[PDB]
Structures are given as C-alpha cells and as structure tokens.
PDB file of C-alpha atoms in Angstrom:
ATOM      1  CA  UNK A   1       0.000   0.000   0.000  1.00 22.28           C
ATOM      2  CA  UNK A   2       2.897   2.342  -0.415  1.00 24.30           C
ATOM      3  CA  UNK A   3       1.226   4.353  -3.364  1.00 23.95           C
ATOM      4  CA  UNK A   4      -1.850   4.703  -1.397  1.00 25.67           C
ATOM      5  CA  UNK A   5      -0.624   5.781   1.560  1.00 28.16           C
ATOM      6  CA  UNK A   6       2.151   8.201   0.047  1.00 28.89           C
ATOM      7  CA  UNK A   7      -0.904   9.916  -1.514  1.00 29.63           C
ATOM      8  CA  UNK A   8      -2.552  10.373   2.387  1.00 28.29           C
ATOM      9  CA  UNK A   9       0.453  11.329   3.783  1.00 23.34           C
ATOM     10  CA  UNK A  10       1.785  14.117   1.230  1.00 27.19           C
ATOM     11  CA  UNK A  11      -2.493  15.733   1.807  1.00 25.38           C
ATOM     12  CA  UNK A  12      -2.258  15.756   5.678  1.00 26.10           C
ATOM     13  CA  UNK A  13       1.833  17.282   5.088  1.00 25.45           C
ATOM     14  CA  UNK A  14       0.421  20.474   3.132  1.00 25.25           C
ATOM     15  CA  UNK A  15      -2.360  20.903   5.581  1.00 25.30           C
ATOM     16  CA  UNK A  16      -0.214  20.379   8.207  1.00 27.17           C
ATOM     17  CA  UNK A  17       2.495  23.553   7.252  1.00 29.51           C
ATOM     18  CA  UNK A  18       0.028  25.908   6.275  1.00 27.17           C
ATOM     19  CA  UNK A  19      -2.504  25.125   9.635  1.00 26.26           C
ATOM     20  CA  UNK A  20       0.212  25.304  12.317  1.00 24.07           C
ATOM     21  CA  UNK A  21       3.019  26.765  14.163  1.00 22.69           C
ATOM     22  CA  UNK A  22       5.158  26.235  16.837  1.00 22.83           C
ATOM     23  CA  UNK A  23       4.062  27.903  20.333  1.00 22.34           C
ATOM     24  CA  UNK A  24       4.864  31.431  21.850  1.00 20.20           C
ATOM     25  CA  UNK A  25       3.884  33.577  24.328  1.00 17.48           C
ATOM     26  CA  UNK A  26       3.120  36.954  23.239  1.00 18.19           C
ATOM     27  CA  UNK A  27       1.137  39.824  25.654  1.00 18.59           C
ATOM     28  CA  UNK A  28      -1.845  40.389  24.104  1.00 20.87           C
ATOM     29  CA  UNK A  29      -2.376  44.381  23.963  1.00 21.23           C
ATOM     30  CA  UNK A  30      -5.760  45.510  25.438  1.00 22.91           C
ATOM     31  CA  UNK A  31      -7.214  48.980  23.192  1.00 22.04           C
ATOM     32  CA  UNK A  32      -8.336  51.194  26.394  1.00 23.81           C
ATOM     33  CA  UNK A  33      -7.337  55.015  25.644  1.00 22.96           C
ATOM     34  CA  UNK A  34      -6.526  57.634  28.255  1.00 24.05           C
ATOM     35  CA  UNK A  35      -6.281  60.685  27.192  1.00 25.18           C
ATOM     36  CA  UNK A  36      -5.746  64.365  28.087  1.00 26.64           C
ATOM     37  CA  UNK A  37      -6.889  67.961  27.022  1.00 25.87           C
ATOM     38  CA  UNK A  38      -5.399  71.459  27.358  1.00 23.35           C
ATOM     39  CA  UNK A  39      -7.970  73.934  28.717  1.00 26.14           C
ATOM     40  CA  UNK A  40      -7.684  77.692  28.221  1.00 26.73           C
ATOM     41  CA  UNK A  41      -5.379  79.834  30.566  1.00 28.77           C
ATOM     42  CA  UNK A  42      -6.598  82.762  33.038  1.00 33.95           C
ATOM     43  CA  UNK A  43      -4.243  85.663  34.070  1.00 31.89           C
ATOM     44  CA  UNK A  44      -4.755  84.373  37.840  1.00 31.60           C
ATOM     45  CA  UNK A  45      -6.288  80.520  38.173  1.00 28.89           C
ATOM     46  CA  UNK A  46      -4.262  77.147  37.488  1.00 29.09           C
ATOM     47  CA  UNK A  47      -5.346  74.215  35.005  1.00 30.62           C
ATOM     48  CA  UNK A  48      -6.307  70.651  35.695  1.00 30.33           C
ATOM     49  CA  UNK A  49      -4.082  67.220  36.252  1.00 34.33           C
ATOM     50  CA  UNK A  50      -3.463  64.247  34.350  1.00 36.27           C
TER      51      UNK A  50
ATOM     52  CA  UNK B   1      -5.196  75.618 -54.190  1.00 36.51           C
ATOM     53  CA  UNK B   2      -7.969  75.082 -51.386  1.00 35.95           C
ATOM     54  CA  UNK B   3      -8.005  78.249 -49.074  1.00 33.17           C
ATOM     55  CA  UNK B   4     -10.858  77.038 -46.732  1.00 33.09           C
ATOM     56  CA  UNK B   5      -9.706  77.487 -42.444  1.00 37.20           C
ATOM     57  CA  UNK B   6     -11.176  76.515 -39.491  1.00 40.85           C
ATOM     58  CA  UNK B   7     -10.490  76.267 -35.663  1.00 40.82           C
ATOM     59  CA  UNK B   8      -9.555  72.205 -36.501  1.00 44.26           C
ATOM     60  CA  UNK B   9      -7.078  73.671 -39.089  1.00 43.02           C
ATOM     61  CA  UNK B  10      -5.313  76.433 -37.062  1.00 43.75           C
ATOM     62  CA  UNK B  11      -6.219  74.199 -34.013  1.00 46.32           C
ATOM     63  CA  UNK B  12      -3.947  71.392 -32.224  1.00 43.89           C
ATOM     64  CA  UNK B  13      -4.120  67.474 -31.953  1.00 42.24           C
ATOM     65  CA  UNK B  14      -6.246  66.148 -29.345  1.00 45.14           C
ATOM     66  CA  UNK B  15      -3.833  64.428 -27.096  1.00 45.59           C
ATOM     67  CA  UNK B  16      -6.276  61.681 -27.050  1.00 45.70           C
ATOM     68  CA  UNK B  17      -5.540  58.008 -25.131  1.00 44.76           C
ATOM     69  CA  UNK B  18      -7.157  55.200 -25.067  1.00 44.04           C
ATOM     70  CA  UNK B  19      -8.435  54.222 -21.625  1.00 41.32           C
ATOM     71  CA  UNK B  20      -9.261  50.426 -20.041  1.00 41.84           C
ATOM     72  CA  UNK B  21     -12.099  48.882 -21.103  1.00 40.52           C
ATOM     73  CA  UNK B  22     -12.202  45.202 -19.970  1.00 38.01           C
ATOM     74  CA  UNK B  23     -12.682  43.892 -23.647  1.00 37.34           C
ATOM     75  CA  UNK B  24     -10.950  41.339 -25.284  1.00 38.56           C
ATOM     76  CA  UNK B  25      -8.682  40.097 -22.266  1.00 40.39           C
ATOM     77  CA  UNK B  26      -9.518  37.085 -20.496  1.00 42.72           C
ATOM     78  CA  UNK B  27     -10.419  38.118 -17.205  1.00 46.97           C
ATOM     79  CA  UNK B  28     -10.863  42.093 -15.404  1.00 46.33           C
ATOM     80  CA  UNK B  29      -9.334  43.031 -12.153  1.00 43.42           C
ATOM     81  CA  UNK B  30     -11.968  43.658  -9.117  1.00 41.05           C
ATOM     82  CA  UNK B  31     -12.165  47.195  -8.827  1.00 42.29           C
ATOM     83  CA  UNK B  32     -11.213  47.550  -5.488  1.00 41.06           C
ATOM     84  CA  UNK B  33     -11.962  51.100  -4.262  1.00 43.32           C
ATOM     85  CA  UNK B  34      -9.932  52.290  -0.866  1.00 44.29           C
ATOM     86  CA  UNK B  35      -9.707  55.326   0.550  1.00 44.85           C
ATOM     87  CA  UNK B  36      -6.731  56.649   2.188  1.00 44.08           C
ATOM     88  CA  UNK B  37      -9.621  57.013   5.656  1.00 43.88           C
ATOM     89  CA  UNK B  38      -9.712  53.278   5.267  1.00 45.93           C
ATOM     90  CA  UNK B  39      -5.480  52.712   4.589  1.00 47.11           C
ATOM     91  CA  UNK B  40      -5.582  54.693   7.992  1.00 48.08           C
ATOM     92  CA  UNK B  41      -7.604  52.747   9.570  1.00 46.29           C
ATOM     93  CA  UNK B  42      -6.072  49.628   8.594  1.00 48.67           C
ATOM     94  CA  UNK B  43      -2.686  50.598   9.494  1.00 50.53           C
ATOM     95  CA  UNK B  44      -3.266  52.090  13.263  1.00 53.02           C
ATOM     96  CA  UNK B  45      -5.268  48.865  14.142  1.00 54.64           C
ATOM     97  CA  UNK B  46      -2.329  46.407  12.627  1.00 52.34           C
ATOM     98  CA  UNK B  47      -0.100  48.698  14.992  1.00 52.72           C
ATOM     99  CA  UNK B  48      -2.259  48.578  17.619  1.00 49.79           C
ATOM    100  CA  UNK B  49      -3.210  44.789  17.611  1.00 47.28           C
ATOM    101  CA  UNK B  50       0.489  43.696  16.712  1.00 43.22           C
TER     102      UNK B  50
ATOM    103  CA  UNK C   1      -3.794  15.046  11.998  1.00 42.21           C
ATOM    104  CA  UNK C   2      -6.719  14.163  13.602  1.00 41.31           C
ATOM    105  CA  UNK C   3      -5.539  16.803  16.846  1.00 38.89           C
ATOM    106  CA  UNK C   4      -4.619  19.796  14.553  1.00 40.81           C
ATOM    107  CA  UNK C   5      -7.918  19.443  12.619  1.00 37.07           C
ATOM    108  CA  UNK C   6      -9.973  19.071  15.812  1.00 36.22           C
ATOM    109  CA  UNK C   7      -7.853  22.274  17.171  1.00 32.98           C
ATOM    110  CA  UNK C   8      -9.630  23.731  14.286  1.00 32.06           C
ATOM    111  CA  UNK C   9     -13.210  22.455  14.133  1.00 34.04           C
ATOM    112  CA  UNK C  10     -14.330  21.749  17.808  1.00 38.43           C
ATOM    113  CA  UNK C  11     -16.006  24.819  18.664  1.00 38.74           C
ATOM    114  CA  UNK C  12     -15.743  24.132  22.304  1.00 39.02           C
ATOM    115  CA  UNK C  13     -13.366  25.472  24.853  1.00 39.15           C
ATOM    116  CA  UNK C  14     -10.723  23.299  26.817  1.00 43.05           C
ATOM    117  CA  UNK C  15      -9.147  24.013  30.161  1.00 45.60           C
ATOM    118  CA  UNK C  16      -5.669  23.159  31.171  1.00 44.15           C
ATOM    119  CA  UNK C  17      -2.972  23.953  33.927  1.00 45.55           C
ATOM    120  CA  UNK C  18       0.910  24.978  34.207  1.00 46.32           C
ATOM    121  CA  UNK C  19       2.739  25.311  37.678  1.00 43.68           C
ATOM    122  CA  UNK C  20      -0.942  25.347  39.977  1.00 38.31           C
ATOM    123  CA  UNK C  21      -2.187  27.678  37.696  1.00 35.96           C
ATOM    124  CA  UNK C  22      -5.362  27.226  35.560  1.00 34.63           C
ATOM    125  CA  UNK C  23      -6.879  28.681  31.888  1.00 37.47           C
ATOM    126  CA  UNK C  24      -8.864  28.513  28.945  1.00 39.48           C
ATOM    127  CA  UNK C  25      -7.636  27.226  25.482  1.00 40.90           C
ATOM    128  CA  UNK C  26      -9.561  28.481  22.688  1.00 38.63           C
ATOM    129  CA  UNK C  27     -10.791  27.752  19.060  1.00 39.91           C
ATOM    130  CA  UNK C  28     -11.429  30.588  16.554  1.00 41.05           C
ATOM    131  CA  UNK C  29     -13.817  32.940  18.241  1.00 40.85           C
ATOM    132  CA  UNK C  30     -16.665  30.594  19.477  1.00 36.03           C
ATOM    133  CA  UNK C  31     -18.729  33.235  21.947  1.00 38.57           C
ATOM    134  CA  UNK C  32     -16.107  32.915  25.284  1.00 38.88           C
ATOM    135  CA  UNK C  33     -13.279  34.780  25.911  1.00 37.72           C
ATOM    136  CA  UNK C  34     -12.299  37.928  25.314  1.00 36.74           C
ATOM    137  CA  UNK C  35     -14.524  39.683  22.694  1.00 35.99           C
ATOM    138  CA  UNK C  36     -12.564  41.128  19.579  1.00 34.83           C
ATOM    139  CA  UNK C  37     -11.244  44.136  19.307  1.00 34.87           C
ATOM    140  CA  UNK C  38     -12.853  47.144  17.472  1.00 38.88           C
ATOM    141  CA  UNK C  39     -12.365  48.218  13.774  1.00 42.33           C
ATOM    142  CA  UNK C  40     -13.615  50.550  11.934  1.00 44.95           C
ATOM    143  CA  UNK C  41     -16.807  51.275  14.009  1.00 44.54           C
ATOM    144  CA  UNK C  42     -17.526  47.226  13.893  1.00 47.33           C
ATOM    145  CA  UNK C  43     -18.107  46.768  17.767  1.00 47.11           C
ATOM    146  CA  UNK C  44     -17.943  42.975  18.916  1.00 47.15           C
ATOM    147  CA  UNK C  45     -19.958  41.946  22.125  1.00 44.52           C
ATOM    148  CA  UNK C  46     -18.645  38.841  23.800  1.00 47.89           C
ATOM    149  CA  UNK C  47     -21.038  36.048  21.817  1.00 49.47           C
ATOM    150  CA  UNK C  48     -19.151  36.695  18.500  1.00 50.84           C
ATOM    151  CA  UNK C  49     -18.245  33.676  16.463  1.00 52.14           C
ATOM    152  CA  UNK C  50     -16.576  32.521  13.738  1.00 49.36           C
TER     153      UNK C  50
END
C-alpha cells in the first residue's frame, strides 16, 4: 500500500504547514485610551491634572 | 489651391488616449476602491493589535 | 492530523494547567473569551463567532 498511503500522507503534510506553528507567548495588547486635554489659561487661576 | 480654415485647421491634436475597457482580455481586475480614511484605519489597528 | 484538525473544528473550549495555575484554550472565536477588538466602528460583544 505504499502508493496509497504516500498519496494520504503528502495531503495531511500540506495541511499540516500551512494550519500550524510552533508555540509562543506573546502579551496580548488591550485597546483602552486615556487621554488628556489642554484647557484655556486665566491671568490668575491654574489648570487641571493628568 | 484650397483656401478654406477653421479652428480644426489652425487648431492642435487632441492628445487623445485610449483608456481600459475590460474587452478582449480574459479576465478584469476587481475594482477595489480604498480610501486613504480606510489605509488609515487599517494601518493604526495592525499597529495597535500587533 | 486528527488533533490539529480538531484544534480547528471543535467549537468548544478546553481548560488546562501549568505550575498550579489554571486557563482557557480556545478555538477561533466561538462566543467565550475575550470579545474582539474594534475596527472601523464594527463593535464585537462577547457572543461573537466565527
């Protein structure tokens, strides 16, 4: 059954390389935006923190 | 000889092209409109999510 | 093959451990988990699936 099973094993060998890769770890970023404004200056007050 | 003017006789060539048509090749590229808003967007959220 | 194709096509989540420490391991997006990011004012609540 060599022919046969060359023919199985040469299918599952493409799908294999283009399905997987070996393991890492990365830190997956979480999108959550802080942000700050200017504000418009008085001869006399102070503006706001950050 | 023949004295007869116009604006096409004192005029200038058209510059004329011809422009794509989609005739007479075998197949047509998808036109694929994108807006540089969208190329924007695309690129900060590969940035973002990388 | 049959364990990378079922990484693929069982929808269900697994759970496993490292050093007394438990988690999730995950399919495509399959409603649990943490929801996909947003893109382009698509906005993904946690039940999205692919």
């Amino acid at each position: 059954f060599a022919e046969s099973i060359a023919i199985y094993n040469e299918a599952m060998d493409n799908l294999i390389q283009l399905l997987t890769y070996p393991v890492t770890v990365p830190v997956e970023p979480v999108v959550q935006i802080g942000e700050t404004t200017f504000e418009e200056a008085t001869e006399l007050g102070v503006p706001r923190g950050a | 000889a023949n004295r007869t003017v116009s604006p096409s006789t004192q005029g200038v060539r058209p510059a004329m092209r011809q422009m794509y048509n989609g005739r007479n090749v075998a197949t047509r590229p998808i036109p694929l409109i994108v807006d540089t808003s969208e190329i924007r967007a695309i690129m900060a959220a590969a940035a973002d999510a990388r | 093959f049959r364990k990378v194709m079922e990484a693929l096509f069982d929808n269900r989540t697994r759970r496993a451990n490292i050093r007394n420490q438990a988690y999730n391991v995950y399919p495509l997006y399959n409603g649990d988990g943490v929801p996909p990011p947003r893109f382009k004012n698509n906005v993904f609540d946690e039940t999205h699936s692919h």
